[PDB]
């Protein structure tokens, strides 16, 4: 009934160009079986969206990577939000929602925007820059650790720790083995910064620790909730901003439209998230026998969701392989969907919007002028190097 495929969605050849294999996964059927890892797969928008929005059947508390926490010990203590189901998910989620609230975004937006404008101004003085290291990485590193309340020392551990977490969702391949081998110094830094004395007043971390008296979370849960923001709060924003710059460099007609109307900045970033989906995949585990796409999936099975493929599914999107900054992006699953939908999405969108706004106002052309290098990770898509020449407006 359900087709079996030998495609390894965690192989370097797949990461190098995933789009043809994603069509093969979509067109084989609504539900596929991936013999390489003994998991079910869904690559069309409909089933990906359905799975995301049925958390009681497709649970997260047995892990959202390949490993099933009922069979293997997690490599680190489970996230209290990502790797929890309702009802235990619910109140920690509320605390993170309030810490990263619209009111919080309003407090920090002017400073985030000034830092974006300053970065672009600085980059225009140099002309030829690496849009990853010098822009997509440098800008989030210039705002988010300070907004967390982190000290200056040790911040070089943030991106490595985040890449470790993302690689550890994958199967036990070399990317995962090597990440875990190298983990100890990054993990030691991150866990220490999660303690209350180490988070500056008013920042995201301090506000989590201040939220420990309402009956929603306890003081001993605050360090792991800070850990969630330190795990997730940087590298996908980096990849999304780098993707937007890549798209504006590859599709100059869209940079021309963005320049003509800088209010398209927010949707231009949202479209970049759909187009390049910084998080390519997440898993769920079935809690019961379930019918999905005409298939009967037993209890205790891993289901791999292809978010990036769902965001390029022609069953859902017109011209899905075109970058269109005026596209109606609502409903894309680059941030997930449902109760786990990215609690930090307002932070990522704020950073992406104000960076693209600075580019829209200050830059006339973005020309690739060197070899583009891909960054490989079991669950993240992104670039390692993006040499561009920036021409001032």
Ligand X SMILES: COc1ccc(C(=O)O)cc1
Q: In the complex with ligand HEM, which residue's Cβ is closer, 278 or 387?
A: 278
Closest approach of ligand HEM to the CB of residue 65, in Å: 10
141 lies in the site for ligand X, by CB under 6 A: no
* Stretch 167-186 residues interacting with ligand HEM (CB under 6 A): none
Neighbours of 341 (CB within 10 A): 13
Q: Are residues 234 and 278 in contact, defined by beta-carbon separation less than 8 angstroms?
A: no
Least Cα distance to 336 among 272, 280, 275 occurs for 280
Give the residue, chosen from 100, 108, 238, 279, that forms a contact with ligand X under the rule CB under 6 A. Answer: 279
81 binds ligand HEM (CB under 6 A): yes
The contact mask relative to Cl ion for 187-226 (x = CB under 5 A, - = no) is x---------------------------------------
CB 235 within 8 Å of CB 186: no
From the list 15-23, 224-232, 305-313, 360-368, the region that binds ligand X by CB under 6 A is: 224-232
For the CB of residue 3, give the shortest distance to ligand HEM in the complex, in Å: 25
**Is residue 79 close enough to count as binding ligand X by CB under 6 A?**
yes
Q: Which stretch binds ligand X (CB under 6 A): 6-14, 78-86, 109-117, 260-268?
A: 78-86
> Does residue number 95 form part of the binding site for ligand X (CB under 6 A)?
no
* Site for ligand X contains 81 (CB under 6 A): yes
CB of 352 to ligand HEM, least distance (A): 7
Contact track, ligand HEM, 49-68, x by CB under 6 A: -----------x---x----
Q: Are 70 and 174 in contact (CB under 8 A)?
A: no
Please, which residues bridge with residue 389 across strands?
128, 367
Rounded to whole angstroms, the Cα distance separating 236 from 234 reads 6
The reply on whether position 228 binds ligand X by CB under 6 A is yes
Smallest Cα–Cα separation from 81: which of 103, 104, 111, 61? 61
Task: Note the residues at the interface with Cl ion (CB under 5 A).
Answer: 76, 187
Would you tell me which residues interact with ligand HEM (CB under 6 A)? 60, 64, 81-82, 93, 96, 100, 228-229, 232-233, 236-237, 240, 273, 278-279, 282, 307, 334-336, 340, 342-344, 347-348
The contact set with ligand X (CB under 6 A) reads: 79, 81-82, 165-166, 228, 231-232, 279
């Amino acid at each position: 009934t359900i087709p079996h495929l030998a495609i390894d969605p965690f192989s370097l050849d797949f990461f190098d160009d995933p789009y043809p294999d994603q069509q093969t996964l979509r067109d084989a059927g609504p539900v596929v079986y991936l013999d390489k890892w003994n998991v079910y797969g869904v690559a069309r928008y409909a089933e990906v969206h359905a799975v995301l929005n049925d958390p009681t059947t497709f649970c997260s508390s047995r892990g959202v990577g390949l490993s099933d926490f009922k069979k293997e010990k997690p490599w680190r203590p489970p996230s209290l939000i990502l790797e929890a189901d309702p009802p235990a998910h619910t109140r920690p989620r509320a605390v993170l929602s309030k810490v990263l609230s619209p009111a919080t975004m309003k407090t920090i937006r002017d400073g985030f925007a000034a830092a974006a404008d300053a970065k672009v101004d600085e980059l225009l003085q140099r002309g030829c820059i690496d849009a990853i290291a010098d822009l997509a990485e440098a800008y989030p590193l210039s705002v988010f650790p300070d907004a967390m309340g982190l000290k200056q020392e040790g911040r070089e551990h943030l991106l490595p720790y985040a890449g470790l977490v993302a690689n550890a969702f994958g199967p036990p391949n070399e990317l995962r083995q090597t990440a875990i081998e190298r983990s100890a110094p990054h993990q030691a830094y991150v866990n220490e910064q999660c303690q209350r004395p180490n988070l500056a007043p008013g920042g995201f971390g301090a506000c989590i620790h201040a939220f420990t008296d309402t009956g929603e979370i306890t003081p001993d849960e605050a360090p792991l909730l800070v850990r969630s923001l330190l795990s997730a709060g940087l590298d996908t924003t980096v990849n999304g901003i780098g993707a937007a710059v890549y798209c504006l460099a590859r599709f100059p007609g869209e940079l021309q439209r963005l320049r003509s109307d800088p209010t398209l900045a927010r949707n231009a970033f949202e479209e970049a998230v759909r187009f390049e989906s910084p998080v390519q995949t997440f898993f769920r585990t079935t809690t019961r026998e379930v019918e999905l796409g005409g298939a009967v999936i037993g209890e205790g099975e891993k289901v791999l969701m292809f978010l990036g493929s769902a965001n390029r599914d022609p069953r859902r999107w017109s011209d899905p392989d075109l970058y269109d900054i005026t596209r109606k992006t609502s409903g894309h699953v680059g941030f997930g969907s449902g109760v786990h939908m990215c609690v930090g999405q307002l932070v990522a969108r704020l950073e992406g919007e104000v960076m693209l706004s600075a580019l829209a106002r200050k830059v006339a052309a973005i020309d690739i002028d060197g070899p583009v290098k891909r960054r490989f990770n079991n669950t993240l898509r992104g670039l390692e190097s993006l040499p561009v020449k920036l021409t001032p407006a």
